[PDB]
Amino acid sequence: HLSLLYHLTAVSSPAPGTPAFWVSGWLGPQQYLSYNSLRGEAEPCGAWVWENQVSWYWEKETTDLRIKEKLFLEAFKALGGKGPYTLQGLLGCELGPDNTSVPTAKFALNGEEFMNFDLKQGTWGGDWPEALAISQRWQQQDKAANKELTFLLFSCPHRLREHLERGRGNLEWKEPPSMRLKARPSSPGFSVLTCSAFSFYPPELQLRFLRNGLAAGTGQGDFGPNSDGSFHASSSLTVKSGDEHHYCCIVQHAGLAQPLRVEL
């Protein structure tokens, strides 16, 4: 059910010493790979340095992402006009029922989706003038279409299977959250309750508020990552001052045998 997704990004004029192009590779919500135009090499990120991996795996990654670098930096020639550009791509695949991959290939220009790669016709598509321009430049190239086909229909799903076997350890990791619920005087006759979840994996997690056992909904939720692949979450609720010790907070999460009632 998890998925291999590359986050390609190129920019038309980078802050100097910054890379023109760079990639982040993800398995589920974990970053396993990292690449950029300065260094020129695909490297493993995080616990994936310790992956029981085969020789040539990484320099196969590098080889593929260099073709991507060339393609992306070529796109800005095709576009011509002034305003700076940012070209993004989301490419990958996810496993399906019958020992089957399901591919993804979408792109965005200056932050808006505009272009895609149809694995049936083997062609890029999109109908904005910008997408027609880039689409054309790529379609007439060192068989770029073919390599995008192989990258998505062959390489990607072969990698994804390999990481599932050789990296269960990381992917099946479970870390339940440390919880704190605290009361914070805010207004005239009001106060803010903040339930906070620290260091949990996987990132799926719900926070709920009860007030004498009955739902008070949720208020503002907030969610983020820690340095180590774990996650952080908090949810906040406005509440009558002096009525605070009546509320508790309930938390669901894969790493807990049953939902946890969290007192104040």
């Binding site: 090499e41 616990a47 085969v54 990484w58 068989k143 073919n146 086909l149 062959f154």
Partner: protein, 583 residues
Amino acid sequence: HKSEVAHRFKDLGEENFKALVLIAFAQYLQQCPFEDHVKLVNEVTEFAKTCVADESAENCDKSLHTLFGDKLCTVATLRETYGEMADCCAKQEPERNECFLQHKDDNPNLPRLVRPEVDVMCTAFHDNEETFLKKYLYEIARRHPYFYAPELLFFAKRYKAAFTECCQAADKAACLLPKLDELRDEGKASSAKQRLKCASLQKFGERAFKAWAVARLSQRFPKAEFAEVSKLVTDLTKVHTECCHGDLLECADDRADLAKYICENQDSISSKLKECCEKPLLEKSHCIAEVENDEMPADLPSLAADFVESKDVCKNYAEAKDVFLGMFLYEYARRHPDYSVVLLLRLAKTYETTLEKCCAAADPHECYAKVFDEFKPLVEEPQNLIKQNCELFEQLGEYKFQNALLVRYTKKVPQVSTPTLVEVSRNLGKVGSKCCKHPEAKRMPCAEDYLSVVLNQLCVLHEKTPVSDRVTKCCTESLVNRRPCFSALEVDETYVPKEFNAETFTFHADICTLSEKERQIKKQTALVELVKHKPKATKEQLKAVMDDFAAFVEKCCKADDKETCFAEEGKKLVAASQAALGL
């Protein structure tokens, strides 16, 4: 003859044909399940039978490449299950076959063969025998797509011989596994020697291989005349050119004819061929490939005669560079079966560089009189390297030795991926086991032959997925000078070191399941990674940080609540390591 399929089938006979075709498909389509290949082989055979019947029948005129091509494009999925292979079905002959050839062993890295249990194997062998042997051919062929087809047939006879000789025993494992393990080891060395042969031909040219062949045959047949060694070198070139381009049917045939020529002309080639020439088709060629050097002639004049003293040196060099230099390798080679062929080619190279420059000189003889001085350093340097490396291998483990190499190569070539580095070291490291056994005289040549094969492996794969400029250079500049190029390489100061962080040593408690073999590969990984954090690190610092590492692992597996330790100590081992390195 109108039909090539017909010709081969006739010549090779049916059983060899079916085998060679099965090899052919295995080598191209490495993941197609066995059953499928058998259908394909059986289809191609049955087609052939209809041309042995009528040579003008529908389609029998076509070339072997068109037919094996047409058939490989039967499986169109190719892309989903092989990748850039499918792009080839797009093309037409001859560009099509060049394509299929480039796209073999993009993926060496195919599942290992766990041997079934000795009894289940002997079950299967006694039951469907004819198949069991086909599965051997298929399994070996597909992991070694450049394996020399005709020899593989012979290995297949040895496999069968081992089971014929051992499944009647009470303790079958005691009998068999030794034989299968030698047969596997012979095999892996053969595949490697052949991959260098094809790299030589494809990437460096006919000239480069011919030079090798002349050096090599002249060592074995030192009494044959230069004229005869050439005809053999030419024959050998046709044969290998053919199995390197995938023409397995043609090359098997031609190899047969060569063995037959060799036996018919024993007298002008070697006295040591009598026994070999009385054997069956398949063991003839193996024997002759494997037999002992003839004793060298009586009163050979000094190499200085023809190549320095004679007043015709520059004349002949101008008139026939490639012939003259061939004469050089022949004359040098026959005088020195002890030296490795790689070394003799380096010497010929220096000779040629020298003549090139010197024949342009005012007095050419004056210029090259001392050419043989230039060869002293080309001989010492290898002897010194093997001498140091065998001292190091005794003074340390097979393990501690590999670590020494791993650190050495990671400093030269840190751009290469950690798992690729670990492996290349393990193989280089095997030069302790293989060569330091042998006595003084024989060490360097064993070493150099083996190293040159291991490095070619690295180069053939690196060329398809380039990551270090330095590897490209060494691999590219000269075939014959790879080893010394790599040895020459200093610490790579271009590399931008990996940096440390809290998460650099992040391990979940799944590492204490690990075996020893498993946990040693992990240590070798951490070692490579430390060098990538600071390439100029001295042996002292490196072992410090590496002891810290093993202190860490031992400690945390031995605690209640394992993951508190990893989580808490994981950053302290980082802090530790920066101190012990400088930063």
